């Protein structure tokens, strides 16, 4: 469930991270071993992104 919304942009540094822009919706967000990051789907891709750059949806 929990799809989140971007509030601050970010540019994927690491191969596995996403590039996100404010206002966008990330789907199927899942928590990971790593602290402070979340896994999601965007523009047909899954990647990690900072849990402190968005907000849950509900």
């Amino acid at each position: 469930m929990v799809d989140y919304i971007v509030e601050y942009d970010y540019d994927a540094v690491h191969d596995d991270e996403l590039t996100i822009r404010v206002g966008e919706i990330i789907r199927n967000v899942k928590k990971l071993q790593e602290e402070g990051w979340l896994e999601g789907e965007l523009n047909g891709r899954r990647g990690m992104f900072p849990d402190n750059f968005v907000k849950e949806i509900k």
Binding site: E7, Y8, Y10, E34, E35, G36, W37, P50, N52, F53
Partner: peptide, 9 residues
């Protein structure tokens, strides 16, 4: 506070 990404691993 313009967010900062917590470093990895």
């Amino acid at each position: 506070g313009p967010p900062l990404p917590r470093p990895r691993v």
